[PDB]
Amino acid sequence: TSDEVRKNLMDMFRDRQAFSEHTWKMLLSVCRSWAAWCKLNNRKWFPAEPEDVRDYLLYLQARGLAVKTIQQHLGQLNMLHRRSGLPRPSDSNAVSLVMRRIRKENVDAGERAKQALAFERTDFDQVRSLMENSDRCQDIRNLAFLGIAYNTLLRIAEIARIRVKDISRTDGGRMLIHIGAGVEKALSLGVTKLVERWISVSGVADDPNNYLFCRVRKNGVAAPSATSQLSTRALEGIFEATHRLIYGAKDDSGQRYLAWSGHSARVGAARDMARAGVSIPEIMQAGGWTNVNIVMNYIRGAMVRLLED
Amino acid sequence: TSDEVRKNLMDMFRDRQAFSEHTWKMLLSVCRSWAAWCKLNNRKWFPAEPEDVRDYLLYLQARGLAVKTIQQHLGQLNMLHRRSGLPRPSDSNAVSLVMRRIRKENVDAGERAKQALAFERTDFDQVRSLMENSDRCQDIRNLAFLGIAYNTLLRIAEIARIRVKDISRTDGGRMLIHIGEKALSLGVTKLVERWISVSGVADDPNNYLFCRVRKNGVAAPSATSQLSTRALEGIFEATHRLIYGAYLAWSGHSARVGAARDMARAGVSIPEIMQAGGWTNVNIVMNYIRNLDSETGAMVRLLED
Amino acid sequence: TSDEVRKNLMDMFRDRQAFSEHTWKMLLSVCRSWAAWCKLNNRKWFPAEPEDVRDYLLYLQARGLAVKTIQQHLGQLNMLHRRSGLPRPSDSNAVSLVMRRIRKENVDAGERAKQALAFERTDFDQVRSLMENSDRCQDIRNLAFLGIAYNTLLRIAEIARIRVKDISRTDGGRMLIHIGAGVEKALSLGVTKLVERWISVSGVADDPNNYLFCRVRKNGVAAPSATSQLSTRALEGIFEATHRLIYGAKDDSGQRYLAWSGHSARVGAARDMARAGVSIPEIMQAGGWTNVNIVMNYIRGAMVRLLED
Amino acid sequence: TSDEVRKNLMDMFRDRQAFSEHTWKMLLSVCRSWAAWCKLNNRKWFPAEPEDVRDYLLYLQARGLAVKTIQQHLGQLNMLHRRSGLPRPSDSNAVSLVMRRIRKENVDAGERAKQALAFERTDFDQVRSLMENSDRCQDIRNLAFLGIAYNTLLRIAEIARIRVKDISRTDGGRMLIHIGEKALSLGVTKLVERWISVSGVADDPNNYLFCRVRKNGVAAPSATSQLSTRALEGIFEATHRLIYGAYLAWSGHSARVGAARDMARAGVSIPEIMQAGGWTNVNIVMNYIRNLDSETGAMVRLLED
DNA sequence: TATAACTTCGTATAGCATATGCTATACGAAGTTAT
DNA sequence: ATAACTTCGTATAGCATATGCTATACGAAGTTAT
DNA sequence: TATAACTTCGTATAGCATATGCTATACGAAGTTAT
DNA sequence: ATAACTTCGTATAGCATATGCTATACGAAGTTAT
């Protein structure tokens, strides 16, 4: 294949918006490291040579990256090749076996996927109990955001996307939110008030095409916008700040999940629903998950009872 | 091999009973619109070249059409090309890409499905009261229809097909409706009679239940032709314009949506709402009863003690 | 393809036991009618010509056969072609469209799949209430068979296959039966006695490798066998006889399902479990069904209540 | 292209860590048995010709082997042929046919999976009583094991891996077990101690919990080598031969099966029996608790009023 | 014997399961080391 | 003219799906200890 | 101004959905028939 | 010799799986009304 490859590649970039901005972000990323690696070793980065890719994967493993990370590089590589006509590195025994070997040894050595710290009902009550009394715009928002996070289990990006017009109400007085027909998420009577209070303190409702959450400057003034949203990077800040607020500084180990993050309310809610007897699938749906293992990991005497009697 | 596709269009025309007239019309409709776009932009419409179709699809997106619509177009174009030894345009990667992009792009722009305006018990009551004591042969027809609809939760094409004999009786007076069965409440059953008499469709069991009513308050019963579905739709619309003046009004399925909801509030086994309008996608029925208060979720339930 | 076809066909017959005896039975059957038809019309039955197959399908339709029957012929034909190398008639627009057209017109004309007459709990109680008092071997068996049919919902062929050795018991005294590891079916206390009574009146237990149900001659003497079983044709007789016993002769319309048959206990049990509130999947499993529609067809005021108040 | 497959066997050997030693042994095992059959019947074993393999599979069926076993054979043969530019034998239609026939044929003949002899509370009690007051260093070990097993519902390879420090304490005395966590009852926790002392594995936290016990009632604690799984299996067997004399006895997973059952009788959330032995196939756990009386079914329930 | 009670047989038509391998345990049994 | 539809064209929402088998349904004809 | 409170950016790593068409209804609106 | 294993070979039972994406995690660097 020749001009074909250059053309197949050319078609991709044209309709690049068929993929998520993050897929592109990662593609380019993995490519930079793949090329960097090839460079430092006198090798042709495209098309990728199986034996080269193998060496590369073993190099990342050796760099101590996570199995799911190594899987990513291999994947983007595979994406770049399929999408362009040529055969994928995963097509060769060398890459395929080494991947599985890399997976096996890491797991065998104890490496496991890190889980997020939960932001449960209790945590919400405490946070609420504390910030409930603030007049600060910053706080009224943060409290309203955490409430929505918890109540709905919506990904931070989904919350950051919410538009005022997307806010229906129910005959109960209970707020409702549409996530793109899509899905309707109903807030409790208590959270609806939290959101009501932030809506009335920022004046985001001054334009139904405005995003519900917006930045709030140091002088306690909201900056609504219908074109730009609050960075999910910031929604993550609200989670981290609120945690510092209560538990202070993060131990300098550098590890992940030493404070709340995007997942926190989701994983936390899954547990409360569990302890409360909710049905597993009930849980699944709410969290938008498709599988039973994701919800299960999040939740973790039987025999010790039978015996003792 | 041009004889190859020729033979196929003959095949297609010979066994056209393999598809619904409806389905066909949509097809001719797509070929019509596509062909025109092709003429206007000097491109060969048949066989449709991928790059040409991709351009077309990008065009429809600008037309402002929904994804389900643009896919209708891509879909029909895909049908005949397959029902001819030709490669379907979705089998090109350029079209696969645009269809994928067009989607995300559109959802991001804020793509929302249409919402049917519900016709709940509350509205039925208000309409009943308003034209309950009316003599206009039409009003009587219109109410008995609004009744059959909200009660049977039947589809309009189905109600238009009802004849004088699909009816059976069973309890206290109320009738039953054979179908392609249904039970009517007593309140509505009392309605579907006043219409039957002051219409005289009873005069012939072959005659359809619902029929035309010329401007003279005079019904034209018949067993040959039946009230168009669009006409039944007009009863829903009209009735609305009657109460609120000129998916903003009511349509053929406002009664189905309204019944599910009213039931959902008296709390009803969700699958028991499938009996209602013969449904699937336990979700579609949800997409109706979503903003209900009993459908708030365990989270709401948990949070409020 | 040439000798290849003759070889592919030759491989099939060699390992013909890879298919059910019924599949073979039908293949040969459909082939006889296909050839008969081709013959009467001066045509080559193999390989089959699409336009010929179309004519054939329209001929069966015109003969008034059931859509599912016409689907069968088309299917066996397709089986014979794929399995032998050549392309299947369903591969041509003519066959494919005509099938769908045939399906459409029949259904549009009202033709629908006939369902079996149910043999429910009440029916069982009555039958039991009547035959309970017989000493006749014939009856003690028939009653024990109907009981198993109802209690377990096992296909008649599965019952006819049951071997004495396949009969475990529970700590309750309740009989248990294994259907080939497989599946265990537990009989109630009442049915276990019925089966106990037939086991003790025939002496089938004189050899664990014997089939539970066996023929019983006119002189009330069981004929156990571990090699031969009671024909499912007979298990169907037990169902028909018991019905005649209670409702007398079948109206000479000739139609199917004017008396109980193999399905009867299955379809009947599905209903009782329904009316009793059993879960849909619960039902499914017991009947061995994989789908929700099969169990639903078997079971068939909402709004009439809301309105009337 | 013989270099093509050569490169592949090099690939396979280089990254052999991609598979478990166990998995490999089974493979060498299959190649061993196959190769021999090939030599004996003068057929080329590599690449394996379909007709040759079909004959082989038909041979194994006569050997009396189970379908899961014959498929093991067909499976491994399929693996290397794919991990070499060669066509897998299952990719022939002759082998596909026999594998299919062999199946039905075998199920018809009466193919039943093996049944694990359960080690229930009743048996644990009987064994406890019998060697509760014994001094033999082994007996103490054996009981503490039978305890850990029925209590933790752990797999044998997992119990063999237990060290002196995976243990944690939590309530009244009972210990906890870190794992690849577990909680022990008080009764068993009292047992797992007598073993720890009269063994002195405590002397070193690296030492494994369970260890060898030479014929002199003398334990050989160690943190380098661990008790083989087979040894743990022997404790289950021996203990049985002790009570009933010489799937007839108990095996490495009789304790797991027994615990599920005993629990199932005290009625236990079926998924809550997955906590027990980390299970899936809600059915496998069923295939254990099947002949239980609470697992009779709604039919039984309905029939008995 | 005539006959119940089947079995077998062919055409019509209804009711389903859609996987495979990697890795663990099974269990007789040859191999090994310290009593 | 105009009420009251019907027919049109095209938008878009709501329902199951396809094979490839394997098994029952039932009248009739053949079989065997009585 | 210094600065809160972000936004953007790149590498690391966790969490999912896997369809498409046939046929019905939608709804403005041109076409038709009897008042 | 023999108890008590360990190592072997091969039978057979019990557990999740593979892509192809798309999204969060978080330190750090760049940006803007205060």
- Note whether D186 and D261 are same-domain residues: yes
Residue A176 lies in a domain: yes
Report the distance separating Cα B257 and Cα B234, nearest Å. Answer: 17
| Partner-chain residue, chosen from A100, A104, A304, that has the shortest CB–CB distance to D184 | A304
Question: In which order are the strands placed within the sheet that holds A167-169?
Answer: A167-169, A175-179, A183-186
Report the distance separating Cα A296 and Cα A289, nearest Å. Answer: 11
Using CA coordinates, name the residue in chain D closest to A91.
D83
- Note whether C183 and C235 are same-domain residues: yes
Mapped onto helix, strand or coil, the DSSP state of residue C202 is helix
**Angle between the N-to-C axes of helices D67-82 and D93-110, in degrees from 0 to 180, rounded to the nearest 10:** 160
Report the distance separating Cα A237 and Cα C170, nearest Å. Answer: 61
Q: List C-alpha distances in Å: D181 to A100, A275, C61, D169, D178.
A: 27, 19, 66, 12, 5
Report the distance separating Cα A18 and Cα A16, nearest Å. Answer: 5
Report the distance separating Cα A300 and Cα A244, nearest Å. Answer: 26
- The letter for the amino acid at B222 is S
- Note whether B74 and B218 are same-domain residues: no
- The last residue of a domain, from among D52, D86, D112: D112
Closest nt by CA–C1' to A297: G15
Report the distance separating Cα A17 and Cα A31, nearest Å. Answer: 19
Q: Is A280 exposed, middle or buried (0-12, 13-18, 19+ CB in 10 A)?
A: middle
- The letter for the amino acid at B31 is C
Mapped onto helix, strand or coil, the DSSP state of residue B279 is coil
Q: With contacts defined as CB-CB under 8 Å, which chain B residues touch C293? A: none
- Answer yes or no: are the C-beta atoms of B223 and B208 closer than 8 Å: yes
For D88, which DSSP code? P
- Mutate: best of B303, B304, B305, partner A, most A CBs <10 A: B303
Residue D24 lies in a domain: yes
Protein A82 CA to nucleic acid H20 C1', in Å? Answer: 11
- The last residue of a domain, from among C52, C82, C112: C112
Q: List C-alpha distances in Å: A290 to A145, A280, A281, D187.
A: 25, 11, 9, 42
Query: What are the backbone dihedrals phi and psi of residue A84, each rounded to the nearest 5 degrees, phi first?
Result: -115, 10
The number of C-alpha atoms within 13 Å of B115 and in the hemisphere containing its C-beta is 14
User: D101 — contact with chain C (CB < 8 Å)?
Assistant: yes
Q: List C-alpha distances in Å: B234 to A68, B288, D190.
A: 59, 22, 82
Q: With contacts defined as CB-CB under 8 Å, which chain C residues touch D93? A: 8, 11
Residue A77 lies in a domain: yes
Query: What are the backbone dihedrals phi and psi of residue D252, each rounded to the nearest 5 degrees, phi first?
Result: -40, -25
- The last residue of a domain, from among D80, D112, D144: D112
The C-alpha R_g of chain D, in whole angstroms, comes to 24
Nearest C-alpha neighbor of B118 from the set B302, B27, B283, B253: B253
Handedness of CA A18, A19, A20, A26 (dihedral sign): negative
- Note whether D278 and D136 are same-domain residues: yes
Protein C239 CA to nucleic acid E4 C1', in Å? Answer: 17
| Partner-chain residue, chosen from C98, C280, C304, that has the shortest CB–CB distance to B15 | C98
Protein B242 CA to nucleic acid E32 C1', in Å? Answer: 100
Report the distance separating Cα D238 and Cα D242, nearest Å. Answer: 6
- Note whether D104 and D163 are same-domain residues: no
Handedness of CA B219, B225, B226, B231 (dihedral sign): negative
- Answer yes or no: are the C-beta atoms of C144 and C195 closer than 8 Å: yes
Mapped onto helix, strand or coil, the DSSP state of residue D180 is coil
Tokens of B112: 């929302």
Resolution in A: 2.5
- Mutate: best of C106, C304, C308, partner B, most B CBs <10 A: C304
- The letter for the amino acid at C21 is E
Residue C308 lies in a domain: no
Handedness of CA A46, A52, A56, A57 (dihedral sign): positive
- Outline where B2-131 has alpha helix (H): 2-14, 21-40, 50-63, 67-82, 93-110, 121-131
C272·D302 Cβ contact <8 A: yes
N-to-C CA span, chain C: 74
Report the distance separating Cα D188 and Cα D186, nearest Å. Answer: 5
Show which residues of B are catalytic: 155, 253, 256, 279, 288
Q: Render C53-108 in DSSP notation, one character per residue.
A: HHHHHHHHHHTT--HHHHHHHHHHHHHHHHTTSSPPGGGSHHHHHHHHHHHHHHHH
Q: List C-alpha distances in Å: D200 to C214, C309, D38, D220.
A: 66, 80, 54, 9
**Angle between the N-to-C axes of helices A121-131 and A264-275, in degrees from 0 to 180, rounded to the nearest 10:** 120
Q: List C-alpha distances in Å: C106 to B58, C50, C94.
A: 41, 22, 18
Report the distance separating Cα A168 and Cα D109, nearest Å. Answer: 65
Q: Which residue is nearest to nucleotide H27 (CA to C1')?
A: A254
Tokens of A180: 């793109």
- Answer yes or no: are the C-beta atoms of D8 and D84 closer than 8 Å: yes
The number of C-alpha atoms within 13 Å of A208 and in the hemisphere containing its C-beta is 5
Mapped onto helix, strand or coil, the DSSP state of residue B298 is helix
- Answer yes or no: are the C-beta atoms of D136 and D217 closer than 8 Å: yes
User: C107 — contact with chain B (CB < 8 Å)?
Assistant: no
Q: How far is CA C243 from the centre of its chain?
A: 18
N-to-C CA span, chain B: 73
User: D8 — contact with chain A (CB < 8 Å)?
Assistant: yes
- Note whether A64 and A129 are same-domain residues: no
Report the distance separating Cα B276 and Cα D233, nearest Å. Answer: 60
Mapped onto helix, strand or coil, the DSSP state of residue D292 is coil
Q: Which chains touch A (3 or more CB pairs under 8 A)?
A: B, D
User: D85 — contact with chain A (CB < 8 Å)?
Assistant: no
For C220, which DSSP code? S
For D289, which DSSP code? H
N-to-C CA span, chain D: 73
Q: With contacts defined as CB-CB under 8 Å, which chain A residues touch B300? A: 151, 174, 186-188
Report the distance separating Cα B24 and Cα B17, nearest Å. Answer: 10
Q: List C-alpha distances in Å: D157 to A143, A212, D231, D252.
A: 50, 55, 10, 9
Peptide bond preceding D47 in cis form (omega within 30 of 0): yes
Q: Residues 6 or more apart from B185 whose CB is under 8 A from it?
A: B151, B174, C301, C303, C304, C307, C308
Beta strand B174-177 with B167-171 is antiparallel
Residue C161 lies in a domain: yes
A83 is an active site residue: no
Q: How many residues does chain B have?
A: 305
- Note whether B126 and B225 are same-domain residues: yes
Q: Residues 6 or more apart from A4 whose CB is under 8 A from it?
A: A85
Q: List C-alpha distances in Å: D179 to B155, D167, D188, D224.
A: 60, 9, 18, 18
Spell out the long-range contacts of D32-38 with Cβ–Cβ below 8 A and sequence spacing 24 or more. D33/D73, D34/D73, D34/D77
User: B66 — contact with chain A (CB < 8 Å)?
Assistant: no
Compute the C-alpha angle B107/B109/B110, nearest 5°: 65
User: A291 — contact with chain B (CB < 8 Å)?
Assistant: no
Using CA coordinates, name the residue in chain A closest to D84.
A93
D59 is an active site residue: no
Residue D142 lies in a domain: yes
Experimental determination technique: X-ray
Domain count along chain A: 2
Tokens 């034909």, located at residue: C77
- Note whether C185 and C105 are same-domain residues: no
Q: Residues 6 or more apart from C96 whose CB is under 8 A from it?
A: C90
- Answer yes or no: are the C-beta atoms of D288 and D253 closer than 8 Å: no
User: A273 — contact with chain B (CB < 8 Å)?
Assistant: yes
Q: What is the 3-state secondary structure (H, E, C) of chain A?
A: CCHHHHHHHHHHHHCHHHCCHHHHHHHHHHHHHHHHHHHHCCCCCCCCCHHHHHHHHHHHHHCCCCHHHHHHHHHHHHHHHHCCCCCCHHHCHHHHHHHHHHHHHHHHCCCCCCCCCCCCHHHHHHHHHHHCCCCCHHHHHHHHHHHHHHHHCCCHHHHHHCEHHHEEECCCCCEEEEECCCEEEECCHHHHHHHHHHHHHHCHHHCCCCECCCEECCCCCEECCCCCCCCHHHHHHHHHHHHHHHHCCCCCCCCCCCCCCCCHHHHHHHHHHHHCCCCHHHHHHHHCCCCHHHHHHCCCCHHHHHCCC
Tokens of D69: 């076993």
- The letter for the amino acid at A223 is A
For B208, which DSSP code? B
Report the distance separating Cα A132 and Cα A126, nearest Å. Answer: 9
Mapped onto helix, strand or coil, the DSSP state of residue B151 is helix
Report the distance separating Cα B108 and Cα A158, nearest Å. Answer: 11
What residues pair up with A297 in beta bridges, in sequence order?
none
Report the distance separating Cα A165 and Cα D219, nearest Å. Answer: 75
Q: What is the dihedral of CA C259, C262, C263, C266, to 10 degrees?
A: 120
Closest nt by CA–C1' to A71: G13
Show which residues of C are catalytic: 155, 263, 266, 289, 298
- Answer yes or no: are the C-beta atoms of A285 and D246 closer than 8 Å: no
Q: With contacts defined as CB-CB under 8 Å, which chain A residues touch B282? A: none
User: A15 — contact with chain B (CB < 8 Å)?
Assistant: yes
Query: What are the backbone dihedrals phi and psi of residue D167, each rounded to the nearest 5 degrees, phi first?
Result: -80, 140
Protein A237 CA to nucleic acid G5 C1', in Å? Answer: 10
Q: Which residue is nearest to nucleotide H2 (CA to C1')?
A: D215
Tokens of A144: 């309203």
In the structure, how many helices (H) and strands (E) does chain B have? 14, 5
Q: Is C89 exposed, middle or buried (0-12, 13-18, 19+ CB in 10 A)?
A: buried
| Partner-chain residue, chosen from D98, D105, D298, that has the shortest CB–CB distance to C273 | D298
Report the distance separating Cα A152 and Cα A124, nearest Å. Answer: 13
Q: With contacts defined as CB-CB under 8 Å, which chain A residues touch B295? A: 186
Residue D91 lies in a domain: yes
Domain of residue C84: give its range. Answer: 2-112
Interface A-B: count of C-beta contacts within 8 A: 86
Mapped onto helix, strand or coil, the DSSP state of residue D62 is helix
- Answer yes or no: are the C-beta atoms of A257 and A267 closer than 8 Å: no
User: D67 — contact with chain C (CB < 8 Å)?
Assistant: no
B94·A11 Cβ contact <8 A: yes
Nearest C-alpha neighbor of D255 from the set D240, D236, D274: D236
Nearest C-alpha neighbor of D122 from the set D225, D296, D265, D23: D265
Query: Residue A81: which CATH number?
Result: 1.10.150.130
- Note whether C93 and C122 are same-domain residues: no
- Note whether B133 and B37 are same-domain residues: no
Q: Specify the DSSP element, H or E, that contains D176.
A: strand D174-177
Handedness of CA D38, D39, D43, D49 (dihedral sign): positive
Residue D305 lies in a domain: no
Report the distance separating Cα A138 and Cα D298, nearest Å. Answer: 58
- Note whether B258 and B134 are same-domain residues: yes
A186·B291 Cβ contact <8 A: yes
Report the distance separating Cα B278 and Cα B263, nearest Å. Answer: 15
Nearest C-alpha neighbor of B265 from the set B296, B243, B234: B296
Q: Which chains touch D (3 or more CB pairs under 8 A)?
A: A, C
- Answer yes or no: are the C-beta atoms of D54 and D98 closer than 8 Å: yes
Nucleotides of E under 7 A from a protein CB: 3-18, 20-29, 34-35
Query: Residue C214: which CATH number?
Result: 1.10.443.10
- Answer yes or no: are the C-beta atoms of A82 and A88 closer than 8 Å: yes
Q: Residues 6 or more apart from A14 whose CB is under 8 A from it?
A: B97
A263 is an active site residue: yes
Q: Render D182-247 in DSSP notation, one character per residue.
A: EE--HHHHHHHHHHHHTTT-TT-TTSBSS-EEETTTEEE--SSS---HHHHHHHHHHHHHHHH---
Q: Specify the DSSP element, H or E, that contains D120.
A: none
D276·A303 Cβ contact <8 A: yes
**Angle between the N-to-C axes of helices A50-62 and A21-40, in degrees from 0 to 180, rounded to the nearest 10:** 100
Q: Within 10 Å of residue B66's Cβ, how many Cβ atoms? A: 15
Tokens 């060898």, located at residue: D212
Report the distance separating Cα B185 and Cα B168, nearest Å. Answer: 13
- Answer yes or no: are the C-beta atoms of B240 and B231 closer than 8 Å: no
- The letter for the amino acid at B183 is A
- Answer yes or no: are the C-beta atoms of B85 and B11 closer than 8 Å: no
Handedness of CA A223, A224, A230, A236 (dihedral sign): positive
Nearest C-alpha neighbor of B256 from the set B244, B239, B273: B273
- Note whether D164 and D96 are same-domain residues: no
Q: Render D129-170 in DSSP notation, one character per residue.
A: HHHTT---HHHHHHHHHHHHHHHH---HHHHHH-BSSSEEEE
| b/e per residue D248-279 (b: at least 16 CB within 10 A) | ebbbbbbbbbbbbbbbbbeebebeebbebbeb
Q: Is D211 exposed, middle or buried (0-12, 13-18, 19+ CB in 10 A)?
A: buried
Tokens 């406002």, located at residue: B254
Beta strands in B127-215 (DSSP E): 167-171, 174-177, 182-183, 212-214
Q: Within 10 Å of residue C196's Cβ, how many Cβ atoms? A: 14
- The letter for the amino acid at C206 is D
The number of C-alpha atoms within 13 Å of A108 and in the hemisphere containing its C-beta is 10
Q: How many residues does chain D have?
A: 305
